[PDB]
Amino acid sequence: MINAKLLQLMVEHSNDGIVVAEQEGNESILIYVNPAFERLTGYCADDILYQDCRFLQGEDHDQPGRAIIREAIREGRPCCQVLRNYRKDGSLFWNELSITPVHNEADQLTYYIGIQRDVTEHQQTQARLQELQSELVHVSRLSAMGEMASALAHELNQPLAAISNYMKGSRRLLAGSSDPNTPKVESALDRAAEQALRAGQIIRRLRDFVARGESEKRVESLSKLIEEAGALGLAGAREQNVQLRFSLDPGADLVLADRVQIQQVLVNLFRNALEAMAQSQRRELVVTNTPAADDMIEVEVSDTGSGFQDDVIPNLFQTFFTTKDTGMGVGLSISRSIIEAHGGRMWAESNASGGATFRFTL
């Protein structure tokens, strides 16, 4: 096979944590650890040997991985779990633990071999991603409701005002009369007019119910929010072989923006480019920042997608104009309103590759 002592050496000098324990009733006493386990746990070998690892949980006793591992050890099946542990210094970390029970026949004794890895970075990144998910969902819901309400307010402000004007006109016409049915009819109009007024107020009410979304701005790094937005919006990039190119300038990264609003602008651009790029020979998405003019900096996002026929391009930012069967046509309108609220100007043009290049300034 392999020189056993060399195997001991290789196990001792590994970077991943390796432990050997022995079964004693309800205890799993440690009989061997490697220096990687020392650096990971922050304890010395002589302090911890011939105890059970339960102490690594500290005061955090009620974790399900504990019961899962207890049952797996009882039944004798190997298992993989994640637990919350604390080192000697008291710092928290997450431990990926893979236990394999083995029955040594030479001793007729049950032992366990445990592989441990420090997965704190992975869990932290997962938490950041889920936080991004929650806030992206919330602000997308807000922007959708707001644009729907504003469009309804306009499209109903026209006929409602028309109705009120017809009421005023008919009343003015009937005022020049003395017939018996005129008063009654007149009163009737008033009732209708009364209701009419309410409708308008109601609209504004619901309108101001959707406009209570906060409009703050803060100093934000463009690099960070570009990475967060790529992490969110670029699901299909791996599967659809999308070539990413970030042409960034480190001296011009900080803009005054709400990071979630810029995230949703970029998310919308990414979703649109990947959806458009379903049938494209070249699949390359480039994001670039450049100085543009008058102390403002321009961000460009270019794709090689299906592009726009000539009749479509000047209708892009209009609310509810859509090309996709499953679209809604509010993404670009909301994005443009966000960019303009930030003091910039956003526009689009066809690219030489037959796809599309979008630009905005901050």
Ligand X SMILES: Cc1cc2c(cc1C)N(C[C@H](O)[C@H](O)[C@H](O)COP(=O)(O)O)C1=NC(=O)NC(=O)[C@@H]1N2
The residue among 52 and 253 lying less far from a second copy, judged by its C-beta, is 52
The residue among 56 and 266 lying less far from ligand X, judged by its C-beta, is 56
| Per-residue contact string for residues 203-242; x = within reach of a second copy by CB under 8 A | x--x--xx--x------------------x--xx-xx-x-
Query: What residues have CB less than 8 Å from 245, skipping those under 6 apart?
Result: 284, 285, 286, 287, 288
Given 69, 139, 266, 316, the residue binding ligand X (CB under 6 A): 69
Residue 48 binds to ligand X (criterion: CB under 6 A): no
Q: Which of residues 108-167 bind ligand ATP (CB under 6 A)?
A: 138
The residue among 203 and 248 lying less far from a second copy, judged by its C-beta, is 203
Q: Which of residues 248-307 bind a second copy (CB under 8 A)?
A: 267, 271
Residue 354 binds to ligand ATP (criterion: CB under 6 A): no
Residues touching ligand X: how many (CB under 6 A)? 21
Given 197, 235, 328, 341, the residue binding ligand ATP (CB under 6 A): 328
Residue 33 binds to ligand X (criterion: CB under 6 A): no
The residue among 21 and 262 lying less far from ligand X, judged by its C-beta, is 21
- CA torsion angle for 340, 344, 347, 351 (degrees, to 10)? -150
Residue 83 binds to ligand X (criterion: CB under 6 A): yes
Q: What is the DSSP string of 106-135?
A: TTTEEEEEEEEEE-HHHHHHHHHHHHHHHH
Q: Give the single-character DSSP code of 189.
A: H
Closest CA to 320 of 150, 189, 180: 150
Residues at the binding site for FMN are 52-54, 57, 70, 85, 95, 116
Distance (Å, rounded) from C-alpha 23 to C-alpha 268? 56
Query: What residues have CB less than 8 Å from 142, skipping those under 6 apart?
Result: 210, 213
Tokens of 357: 């290049």
Residue 119, binding choice from ligand X, ligand ATP, a second copy, none, Cβ under 5 to 8 Å by partner class: none
Q: Which of residues 36-55 bind a second copy (CB under 8 A)?
A: none
Distance (Å, rounded) from C-alpha 127 to C-alpha 64? 19
Closest CA to 236 of 282, 272, 286, 287: 272
Residue 31 binds to ligand ATP (criterion: CB under 6 A): no
Q: What is the DSSP string of 207-247?
A: HHHHS-S----EEEEHHHHHHHHHHHH-THHHHTTPEEEEE
Q: What is the DSSP string of 29-94?
A: EEEEE-HHHHHHHT--HHHHTTSBGGGGGTT----HHHHHHHHHHHHT--EEEEEEEE-TT--EEE
Distance (Å, rounded) from C-alpha 16 to C-alpha 247? 37
Residue 331 binds to ligand ATP (criterion: CB under 6 A): yes
Given 33, 36, 114, 266, the residue binding ligand X (CB under 6 A): 114
Residues at the binding site are 52-54, 57, 70, 85, 95, 116
What is the smallest separation between the CB atom of 48 and ligand ATP, expressed in angstroms?
A: 44
Instruction: Name the residues that contact ligand ATP, by CB under 6 A.
Output: 138, 268, 271-273, 276, 303, 305-308, 312, 316, 322-324, 327-332, 356
Instruction: Name the residues that contact ligand X, by CB under 6 A.
Output: 19, 21, 26, 28, 52-54, 56-57, 66, 69-70, 73, 83, 85, 95, 97, 99, 112, 114, 116
